[PDB]
């Protein structure tokens, strides 16, 4: 859920997710429409594809654990969804953290307006 997620991406960016991450782009809130903004918009765009593919599930609900090995993050043995969604979020904090590079002030608190058109996955 939010809740673990958030955790991977404070401890991987130094940042809090919300609201670090939660308005960032066209991709990095709730929306999905348009062409990222950058980098860092494209981590969220991947991570709503990889949500997107997790029809059995319930990705930004579902609770599940993980733990950290050798300094980094370990989706621990659970239900196959708390599995994957568990990778989809590592998969996103680990891409925020490689691109802080280029990440962008001006792209927090975006407007959706100005994101439309449909971007396949
Ligand atoms: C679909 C989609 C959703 C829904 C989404 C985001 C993106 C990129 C998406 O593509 C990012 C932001 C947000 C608005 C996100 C994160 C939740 C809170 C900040 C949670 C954090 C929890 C903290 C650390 C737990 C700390 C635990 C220790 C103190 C033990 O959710």
Same mark, same amino acid.
């Given at each position: !859920?939010?809740?673990?997620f958030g &955790? *991977?991406?404070?401890?991987? =960016? %130094? &940042?809090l997710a919300?609201? !670090?991450? !939660?308005?960032?782009?066209?991709?990095? %809130?709730?929306?999905? +429409?348009? =062409?990222?903004? $950058? @980098?860092?918009?494209?981590?969220?765009?991947?991570? $709503?594809?990889?949500? %997107?593919?997790?029809?059995?599930?319930?990705p930004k609900? $579902?609770?599940?654990?993980?733990?950290?090995?050798?300094? @980094?993050?370990? #989706?621990? &043995?659970? =239900? !196959? #969804?708390?599995?994957?969604?568990?990778?989809?979020?590592?998969? @996103? @904090?680990?891409?925020?953290?490689?691109?802080?590079?280029?990440?962008? +002030? +001006?792209? *927090?608190?975006?407007?959706?307006?100005? #994101? &439309? %058109?449909?971007?396949?996955?």
């Open positions: !859920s939010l809740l673990e &955790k *991977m991406i404070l401890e991987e =960016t %130094g &940042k919300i609201p !670090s991450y !939660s308005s960032y782009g066209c991709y990095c %809130g709730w929306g999905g +429409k348009g =062409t990222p903004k $950058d @980098a860092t918009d494209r981590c969220c765009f991947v991570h $709503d594809c990889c949500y %997107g593919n997790l029809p059995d599930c319930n609900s $579902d609770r599940y654990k993980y733990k950290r090995v050798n300094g @980094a993050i370990v #989706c621990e &043995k659970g =239900t !196959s #969804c708390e599995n994957r969604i568990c990778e989809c979020d590592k998969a @996103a @904090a680990i891409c925020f953290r490689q691109n802080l590079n280029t990440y962008s +002030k +001006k792209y *927090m608190l975006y407007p959706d307006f100005l #994101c &439309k %058109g449909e971007l396949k996955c």
